Amino acid sequence: SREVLAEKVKNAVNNQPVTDMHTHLFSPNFGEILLWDIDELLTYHYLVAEVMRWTDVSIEAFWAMSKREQADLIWEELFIKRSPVSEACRGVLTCLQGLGLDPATRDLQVYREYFAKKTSEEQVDTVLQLANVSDVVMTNDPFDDNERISWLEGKQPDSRFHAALRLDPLLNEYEQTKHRLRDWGYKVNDEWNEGSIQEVKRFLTDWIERMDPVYMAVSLPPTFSFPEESNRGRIIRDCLLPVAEKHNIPFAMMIGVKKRVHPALGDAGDFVGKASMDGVEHLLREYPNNKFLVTMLSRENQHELVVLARKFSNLMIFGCWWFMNNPEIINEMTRMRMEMLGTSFIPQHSDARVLEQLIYKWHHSKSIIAEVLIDKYDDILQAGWEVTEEEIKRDVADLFSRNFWRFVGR
Amino acid sequence: SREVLAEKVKNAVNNQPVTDMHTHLFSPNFGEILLWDIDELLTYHYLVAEVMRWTDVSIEAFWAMSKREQADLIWEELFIKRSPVSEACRGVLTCLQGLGLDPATRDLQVYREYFAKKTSEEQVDTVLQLANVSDVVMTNDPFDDNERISWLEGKQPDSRFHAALRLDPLLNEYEQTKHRLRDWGYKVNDEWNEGSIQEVKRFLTDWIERMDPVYMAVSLPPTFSFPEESNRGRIIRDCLLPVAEKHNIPFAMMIGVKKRVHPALGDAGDFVGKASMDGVEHLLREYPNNKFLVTMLSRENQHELVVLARKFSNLMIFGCWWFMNNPEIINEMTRMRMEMLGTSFIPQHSDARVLEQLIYKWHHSKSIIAEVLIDKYDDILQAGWEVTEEEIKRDVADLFSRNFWRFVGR
Amino acid sequence: SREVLAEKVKNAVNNQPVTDMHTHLFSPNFGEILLWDIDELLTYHYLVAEVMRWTDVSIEAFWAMSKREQADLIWEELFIKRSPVSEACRGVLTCLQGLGLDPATRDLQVYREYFAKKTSEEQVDTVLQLANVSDVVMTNDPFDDNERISWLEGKQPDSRFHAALRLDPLLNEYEQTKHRLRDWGYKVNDEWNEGSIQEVKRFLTDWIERMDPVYMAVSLPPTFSFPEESNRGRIIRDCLLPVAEKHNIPFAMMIGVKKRVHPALGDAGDFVGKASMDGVEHLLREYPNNKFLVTMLSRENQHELVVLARKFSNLMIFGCWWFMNNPEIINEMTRMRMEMLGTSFIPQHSDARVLEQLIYKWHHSKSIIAEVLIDKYDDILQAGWEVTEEEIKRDVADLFSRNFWRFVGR
Amino acid sequence: NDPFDDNERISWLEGKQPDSRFHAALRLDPLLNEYEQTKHRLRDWGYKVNDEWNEGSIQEVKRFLTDWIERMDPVYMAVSLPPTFSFPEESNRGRIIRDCLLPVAEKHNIPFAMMIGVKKRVHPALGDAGDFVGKASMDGVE
Numbered sequence A, B, C: 001s002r003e004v005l006a007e008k009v010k011n012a013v014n015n016q017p018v019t020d021m022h023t024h025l026f027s028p029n030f031g032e033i034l035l036w037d038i039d040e041l042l043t044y045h046y047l048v049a050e051v052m053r054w055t056d057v058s059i060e061a062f063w064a065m066s067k068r069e070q071a072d073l074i075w076e077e078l079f080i081k082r083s084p085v086s087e088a089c090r091g092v093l094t095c096l097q098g099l100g101l102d103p104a105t106r107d108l109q110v111y112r113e114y115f116a117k118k119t120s121e122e123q124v125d126t127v128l129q130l131a132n133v134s135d136v137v138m139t140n141d142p143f144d145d146n147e148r149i150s151w152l153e154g155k156q157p158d159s160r161f162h163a164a165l166r167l168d169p170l171l172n173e174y175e176q177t178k179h180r181l182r183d184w185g186y187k188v189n190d191e192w193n194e195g196s197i198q199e200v201k202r203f204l205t206d207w208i209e210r211m212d213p214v215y216m217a218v219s220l221p222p223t224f225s226f227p228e229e230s231n232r233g234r235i236i237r238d239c240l241l242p243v244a245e246k247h248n249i250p251f252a253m254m255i256g257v258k259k260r261v262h263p264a265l266g267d268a269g270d271f272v273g274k275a276s277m278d279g280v281e282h283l284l285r286e287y288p289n290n291k292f293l294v295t296m297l298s299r300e301n302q303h304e305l306v307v308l309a310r311k312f313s314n315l316m317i318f319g320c321w322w323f324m325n326n327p328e329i330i331n332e333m334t335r336m337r338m339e340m341l342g343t344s345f346i347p348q349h350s351d352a353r354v355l356e357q358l359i360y361k362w363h364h365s366k367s368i369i370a371e372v373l374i375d376k377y378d379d380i381l382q383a384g385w386e387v388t389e390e391e392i393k394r395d396v397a398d399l400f401s402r403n404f405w406r407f408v409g410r
Numbered sequence D: 001n002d003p004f005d006d007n008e009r010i011s012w013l014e015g016k017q018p019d020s021r022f023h024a025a026l027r028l029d030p031l032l033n034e035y036e037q038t039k040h041r042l043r044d045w046g047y048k049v050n051d052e053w054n055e056g057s058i059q060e061v062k063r064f065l066t067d068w069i070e071r072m073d074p075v076y077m078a079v080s081l082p083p084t085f086s087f088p089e090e091s092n093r094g095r096i097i098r099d100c101l102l103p104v105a106e107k108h109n110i111p112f113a114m115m116i117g118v119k120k121r122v123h124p125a126l127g128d129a130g131d132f133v134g135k136a137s138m139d140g141v142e
């Protein structure tokens, strides 16, 4: 029956240890960059954008408040003055309950008590256990002063944390970044010649050696195109692709983000745009020895992206990114994906910026993926097919963990 | 439980008095422009387009028939020859049943009897009571000869009816409209100079003074862009925006309509197109002291529009407009909206052209919005949150009425 | 009640004989072009694309394998190593069960036994009976050497099979095709003059005379536009349209296919793109005496296509084509269509390349269409409308068969 | 000297050497501007170019150029181009120039002559007198 299947699917999904292949979390020993707290959860930029639609407090005043005050404002405006029904607000409550706290009391002061008596290491153990996350993939930007520090000091991340070499500044801001490269000893010239090419490669190789990243990544605008006689186009073609092939490291492209449409909002000021599939199509076909992990921001790019994955095996689609990370969208995306790709895709990643988010991000997404799995297994069951519990666990393992590790070559 | 919640949500939704912030209805005392009748309901242009896909009667012959004959044809073709399953046909039946008539008999002659013995004022009282609509926002075009009359005669609308200054002819047909402005005493010159600017402002100010509109509005094509060195671009930049800021009146933009692709169909001859978000993005960011009410016609513009609202608080999204006003779409739009905006948006408007439509428009939309509210409240309930009935009524009040009045400054 | 209605709708839908207005099947007497077998089902290009996302076997090696080996590989990779949850894999199982075979045993060798002891004619009788398909519309390309043979030999197709004149080579590859036309006696000149025009018309007329097609068809790219001073634009304008009007034959346009993005994949190497609606809009309005059957490949073209059908009665929308032929999409498309068009559209076609697919294609689509019909009938039932079983059968007959025959003029 | 012209191929294939006052120039219009049609002739001549632009197609096109350079000993390779000429470009012309012509020309130190601006056959019936002209962008040459 469907209910017998349902229980097996839900059990398999809930018990399957998750490999979160894209987050903004950091190994505890890396320091304060690792954000956690009910205060951090409430000041997540997703909620900053949401509170600004309600509060009379200016954005300037908001940025001038302490994190405690910002959190108090957001709690009052989005949870008390109006029901916390949005996905992000729902997420906060899910994290609280998961930690054993009681959302029924709406006692923020009591919730804060829970966090103030623990250490980073302890909360990490707690959260990964609760979220059943075995591996976390970080976003490591060698262009950030704070992050560069731990890496240069020789600090190695926790074994549960993996590095990913983020290259946004290099690919999207070369004109400014080239100068920093020079200061660091990478002799790139004013013009794109053999010298500049080799030094950029040396730069990538040095960080690959230092981080041992599972992949190199970059977020791109709606106008992204390739090939292109631009700094980005040339760097990707002459340096990134060749280096990635040599070390058999996949290239992750997060396409569709239009940066800073509302500067004053900070991290909450980015917009979205539909991109052309031409560049991705070209990269996949012309670089068969390169591997590509892709996720797009526009709802209107989702279906064609699935179709492109049917064309090229060197393409691995992943997650329901940012503005796509909402139940209604996650549901439609996951169903279209399983329908045209079976289980050859990575349904989700958390993109967690605050440690505790791993709880709600995976909880909310797992229940949806579980329902989709139940429908699909049931359809073949009605066709006379018999699926074993072991086959279910196998499929679930591919979706939440094995597809990623298998694609990156680990 | 979910069923206890369901009843509370449905009750709150059904009892919440509605402020319909965009319709094509008129205060009864305004005259015959106020359309009502089972005949008017059946000759709604939405059904004209639908009947032309079935009937062998030429469009010319149709326009030559009396309204009674047109209604008879549409009833026969869309209700008798085929089941009235489309949204618009379903709407007609909902209006009948709501009025106490019986769709089971399919007796159009009997239905007509009900309307012929009442007055405009009486039917208005009846419908607003049935639809539980407390306030109706009109669309008042000072460029229409018939409408200009009541306003110039000094006629004030019923207290339940509010004015909205529609400016399509001014913004999209200035080359022709400028001449009428001159005939009315507004000395606009051949070239866009201080004189033309001031006289256009004087024109807007005079009508704002006469109508006391809750907002100024315009429908725009898929190709809409801003800024732009065109009559529209210049009028918006040099006159509309400044005047709207001074009187703190919001600017409503209904984007995506491609006018007259099938001229012979009349009001049923408009098409749709996806628009670029650039112009809206620019307006929101560069005019922070101006308020904007926006609704778009293309299904492919919906998600990005929600994201843009997360960026700018001077943007208030509203309704599921025209071709978007169908269950399947209303559902997906409302869910995406609540998920990314919580309750900071106006889910719907009727766009009613015929008085009785208020019944089905709100009935059909309320049941969908109610189901979405139930899902979202249930999700936070499962997270341990407890929502009171008063909080539900508060949220419902914001969605169906308070968000609008609060945004316009009333 | 809804369950009483449900049974009537499901019964009507299941019993309604289907006219499949677009397939890639052939009358049995046409020869081996008629594909059938569990081996053919498994080597369907939809599954080739899917297996290439999993298998380590090179595409070259795959094309070098025998059909038996290809089928074995696909069965092992997509059904045994991972659960066959994708739509195409689900389809294979549905066909097996429908034929009386047992998917529970996963015994491919036993399944093969069933097919090896029957004749084409026998399997055709079997499948059409099982799929309850009364009429099959073929895709007949006079430019294919193999197909041209039966037609030139004077072979007439089975009475259950209808011809459709496919013109892709003529319209999209005229520069190469013109030479073949000359070799066949059609004196087209180097330049587009009266001579070339008349000879192209003569060519179309000759094949219309030989095939007696229900319609002429062509698949078009995302960049399709009209009018256009190109071979395609000129051929459509000066030859196709005039000839189609004269014989009152509709023109079918399948828009949105980007051919060969992955050449090595063969038939599995096509991609998709969103098209502009301008060309279709122009054709519908400027050629009122011509009939057009249209289906588009991009998910983002679906809603506007429905709106365009509301504008022009000479437009008949049909099916959920190729990448659109997935439950999640079929559901949303069918609901948007019924909501804005009632029953004036053709919900589906199979596009079957392998005989047995008629079973799963129609089985999977019928259950979805049935659920949509049940919702819509229920909505008007709740409005007080009473629908008779005969009206249901009538509506179902229009959707699955009469709308097509009525539109083509048969 | 157009190796794609039947009449012209003869003398070269027969081993005929031109008068000492006459020098050869390898004209490549058919190769660069009509590859889709020309590729088939290359195949018939033994140059195994594939359907897709890969190492194989590249090497065989180079072999073709090298063979004729060897046979003609041209002072330069030449081509006439349309007003819309651009470079780089993901087209047959753009790829052939980038992956074959330029490399081969550098190796043998042979210059590349480009005669830009001709819009072919605007008046077909006039034959050789049917070509028109158009202003080109300097971007590709630059």
Ligand SMILES: O=C(O)[C@@H](O)C(O)[C@H](O)C(=O)O
Binding pocket: A024, A139, A219, A254, A267, A322, A351, A353
């Ligand atoms: O929080 C987010 O998802 C964004 O602000 C970014 O971190 C984005 O996911 C990125 O990786 O660029």
Ligand SMILES: O=C(O)[C@@H](O)C(O)[C@H](O)C(=O)O
Binding pocket: B024, B139, B219, B254, B267, B322, B351, B353
């Ligand atoms: O009936 C309609 O919705 C349209 O014909 C128009 O009234 C549109 O809503 C508009 O306001 O321009």
Ligand SMILES: O=C(O)[C@@H](O)C(O)[C@H](O)C(=O)O
Binding pocket: C024, C139, C219, C254, C267, C322, C351, C353
């Ligand atoms: O199998 C398919 O649907 C495609 O490969 C084509 O046959 C397409 O449907 C077409 O008719 O061009």
Ligand SMILES: [Cl-]
Binding pocket: A274, A300, B274, B300, C274, C300
């Ligand atoms: Cl789109």
Ligand SMILES: [Zn+2]
Binding pocket: A022, A023, A024, A139, A351
């Ligand atoms: Zn991220």
Ligand SMILES: [Zn+2]
Binding pocket: B022, B023, B024, B139, B351
């Ligand atoms: Zn309106």
Ligand SMILES: [Zn+2]
Binding pocket: A332, B332, C332
């Ligand atoms: Zn949906």
Ligand SMILES: [Zn+2]
Binding pocket: C022, C023, C024, C139, C351
């Ligand atoms: Zn087909």
